[PDB]
Design a protein around this ligand. Structure first.
Ligand SMILES: Nc1ncnc2c1ncn2[C@@H]1O[C@H](COP(=O)(O)OP(=O)(O)OP(=O)(O)O)[C@@H](O)[C@H]1O
Ligand SMILES: Nc1ncnc2c1ncn2[C@@H]1O[C@H](COP(=O)(O)OP(=O)(O)OP(=O)(O)O)[C@@H](O)[C@H]1O
Ligand SMILES: Nc1ncnc2c1ncn2[C@@H]1O[C@H](COP(=O)(O)OP(=O)(O)O)[C@@H](O)[C@H]1O
Lengths: 490, 12, 531
């Protein structure tokens, strides 16, 4: 609807009495460029615009069809297209009705020599000797970068399904099968819509056909009356069709796959601090940028904790920048990926961004020391940039080399620090043991006794504890394994 | 730095 | 109607591809089984395009050849790609829009009662290349695609046509034809599995076995086991190459004159050694692996002491752990010790004994001569490939050399090191497992680079020091007679009781001593000098 802009701004001059326009000299906008991903219905909108405005019958021409066999005949067609409008304006003038021409797939033929003579003809006819304000050309393209630079200039082309809609189109497609009492009541259309997040209409038709195909198979290796589409076919057919989108919200859910244990109260304290900072960002209108640092010994667990806080926040926008996503790229590509990831966080009222293993993004190795100065400077500049007006950010970055960041003098960029010490008391080990149901009560009572007489100060990370329990579960379930392994990992 | 060849069709 | 009432697919030659056949049958001809009335009642349209693609020599043309006769279809019209083009102007587009006339006529005549007409386009990528190639020349290579697209999209309601296109390179096909309503379903044909290779071997040797021309000794299971990566065409080639040997024992080509034993002609019979020799002649073109690891342990094991047994047992424990548990989806191990002790051999032995579906080895020999970007791409591709199968083992050999370490700078390549550091910690996609085993000889240098935190466990491989182990390796190598082997050890006991050599150097010294003078004066001299 925000349909309002194009109507208010572009299509307002024609409303006034013609003599006023003729006298003042105000010029009507000529070009409108509708762009977007495939399947958005750009053709539908182009068709609807003409009928809604009571304009002349649109002349629909395909982009690739513009190519002509005869030399110069393409120019002849292009110039012939305008004859009706030119003659109509000549007969009357300002009173000529609005003529609309839509050229589907403009970038197919209008690239930077038939495809050059077509541009020559179009540009010769569009501007200069002609002052035809009764012609509106709509250019639609899935790839905006391919448009010729000769047309991207002022005076030419100046102006540049949802969940419910997806459910409505599902209902439209299903009407025929649902009406004829061939659909089982177990099938939940809203469930399928929740499953199909990044699908277009043709994909929906494909899923419908494949799902029916499985019902077809069920019969064929005269009971045709029992041909019914079941939910199992819909669930099974999802493996054939595939979308062409991407999401990182899943990445923030796998980082906490191992779950929480609440083995100590300091975990609860850290979670409370995180929920306090998130609320502070939510409520205050002045604090438009908050930066936090989460630091501690290696292996203590820091990405999982930050991911948990972010998932508990409940903001509309959440994302993660991890080394895994950047692997294999060149430097000039990493600096652009990091820039784009930041530029996409300024388009929503509230945002959360998580940065993982800061020192690893910078390529730090202590022998040289060697590191990449360009990425470091990019991150340093970005972490202090205020978001645009009325938008807020919460950035959480995790690191394990506090001393290195101190050396680089980057520490002034963060507002607050949170330390996560790894467990050291055998009470935490008992809690983890009961949580992981490693052994019966007798073994879990004997393990503490065996440890207390060999290793009073524990000082082991939680990740290591989990992996050691997992590996010890197999060899010898009794204590005679764990106490040794852990003593070796002390 | 490019060059091109050329082919030919007869008359209909 | 659409399938003959007398057909079961057991007779047809194609074997080893059963899932693909079921998928094609379900998604292509299923909608044309019922009476028509149901389909319109259900609001489902028919499929129009089918695409088959795969590596060279997998069986697609066989399917195309036999489908027409197998499924009671109208004689399909077969046209090779480059046969469409013609000289005079407008001839090609006519030739394309001259194939569909019969279908149009029958449709107009009989409505929905029209039978099914099928036309298959061999070598699809020949003519229908990208229609934005450019070149500033005769455009007959573009109006062809436009004509086919016009008659396939703007069909004017032709709903009784199914086009099949077989190709070897999908990438070259114009993208405009890969969209809904035009070549929708795409079926990939890949290399056969072990059971499919047994089926192919049975099909190929059917006629040979029936006429008692094959000796009972031959065992098809063993052959199916040996042919690791053979496609169908290579199996047929193997069969006839092996038959050539049997043919060439009665007729001696070249040597002498034509001497045809008319009696052995009736006793012609193939045997196992012929098949093994044929395996020797024919080679596959895919390969990947399962040979480098075998050659890496060519010298074999010796079990000269208990340490070898303990290390092998630990490797077995870890492979069991990665095989059983579902929560441990990634395990990495380090194998470190003095230079020359023998490390790669031990890792290769464990990997071979594991018996997992996927196994490979990365060594500096493969990467030699590449540029740095090529090395990075190669390592990345190898890892990504390993992330595929349900179970996987990966061996990394001589880490320090992969990074170009020289201690005068110290100079080394930081990019490769960082990529390996990030990759050794990446868990594989959901419900897959990996076991990484990396070996090194410069433990301290790895300590300095601070990459020692990405390895779960470490295994040392101390070299031998007791004269008993030297005696064991000597007796296993059969260097000298028993008296000499005793005498050398008694002499060395007092010559130099303390001992630290290795394994590789021992065998090298043994061989050099065998060559020149097996007496003490050479072997013991070298052994003392090295230590
Ligand atoms: N506070 C916590 N309470 C319970 N479990 C935790 C906690 N923090 C981390 N974990 C567990 O640790 C597992 C892995 O830890 P994680 O990957 O976060 O370690 P890390 O310290 O960030 O790693 P790195 O060594 O790469 O810096 C997670 O799956 C989660 O199960
Ligand atoms: N336990 C063993 N018993 C018998 N032969 C062995 C044993 N270990 C290694 N070998 C053999 O010793 C030779 C040297 O082994 P290998 O090539 O693995 O050496 P390495 O220590 O990895 O080499 P490098 O010094 O180049 O790093 C090979 O023939 C290998 O088969
Ligand atoms: N199941 C099978 N898979 C692959 N090839 C087979 C099979 N059965 C027989 N063959 C033999 O392999 C060849 C098939 O290769 P073909 O499909 O013609 O190659 P391409 O895939 O390049 O068209 C024929 O010689 C055929 O006799």
């Amino acid at each position: 609807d925000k349909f309002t802009k194009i109507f208010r701004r572009a299509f307002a001059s024609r409303i006034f009495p013609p003599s006023v326009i003729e006298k003042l000299g105000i010029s009507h906008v000529k070009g409108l460029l509708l762009y977007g991903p495939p399947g958005t219905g750009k053709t539908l909108i182009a068709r609807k615009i003409g009928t809604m405005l009571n304009a002349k019958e649109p002349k629909i021409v395909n982009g690739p069809e513009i190519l002509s066999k005869y030399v110069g005949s393409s120019e002849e067609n292009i110039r012939n297209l305008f004859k009706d409008a030119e003659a109509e304006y000549r007969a009357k003038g300002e009173e000529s009705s609005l003529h609309i021409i839509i050229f589907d797939e403009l970038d197919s033929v209008f690239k930077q020599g038939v495809g050059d003579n077509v541009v020559n003809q179009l540009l010769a006819k569009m501007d200069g000797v002609d002052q035809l304000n009764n012609i509106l050309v709509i250019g639609m393209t899935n790839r905006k970068d391919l448009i010729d630079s000769a047309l991207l200039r002022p005076g030419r082309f100046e102006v540049q399904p949802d969940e419910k809609g997806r459910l409505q189109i599902f209902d439209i497609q299903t009407k025929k099968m649902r009406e004829n009492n061939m659909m089982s009541d177990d099938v939940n259309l809203a469930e399928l819509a929740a499953l199909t997040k990044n699908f277009s209409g043709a994909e929906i038709e494909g899923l419908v056909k494949s799902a029916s195909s499985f019902a077809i198979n069920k019969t064929v290796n005269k009971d045709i009356a029992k041909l019914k589409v079941t939910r199992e076919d819909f669930l099974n057919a999802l493996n054939d069709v595939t979308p062409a989108f991407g999401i990182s919200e899943e990445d923030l859910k796998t980082c906490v796959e191992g779950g929480m244990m609440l083995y100590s109260e300091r975990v609860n304290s850290i979670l409370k601090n995180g929920a306090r900072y998130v609320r502070q960002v939510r409520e205050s209108d002045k604090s438009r940028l908050v930066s936090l640092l989460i630091h501690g010994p290696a292996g203590s667990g820091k990405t999982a904790l930050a991911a948990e806080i972010a998932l508990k926040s409940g903001f509309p926008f959440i994302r993660l920048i991890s080394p895994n996503e950047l692997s294999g790229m060149s430097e000039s590509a990493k600096i652009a990926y990091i820039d784009n990831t930041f530029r996409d966080a300024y388009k929503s009222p509230l945002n959360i961004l998580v940065i993982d293993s800061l020192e690893t993004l910078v390529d730090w190795v202590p022998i040289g020391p060697r590191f990449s100065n360009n990425i470091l400077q990019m991150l340093k500049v970005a972490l202090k940039r205020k978001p645009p007006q009325d938008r807020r950010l919460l950035i959480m970055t995790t690191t394990s080399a506090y001393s290195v960041l101190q050396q680089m003098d980057i520490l002034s960029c963060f507002d607050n620090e949170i330390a996560v010490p790894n467990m050291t008391n055998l009470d935490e080990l008992n809690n983890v043991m009961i949580e992981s149901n490693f052994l019966d009560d007798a073994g879990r009572v004997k393990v503490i006794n065996e440890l207390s007489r060999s290793c009073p100060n524990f000082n082991v990370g939680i990740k290591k504890t989990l992996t050691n329990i997992e590996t010890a579960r197999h060899d010898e379930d009794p204590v005679n394994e764990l106490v040794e392994l852990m003593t070796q990992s002390a | 730095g490019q060059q091109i060849f050329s082919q030919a069709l007869l008359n209909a």
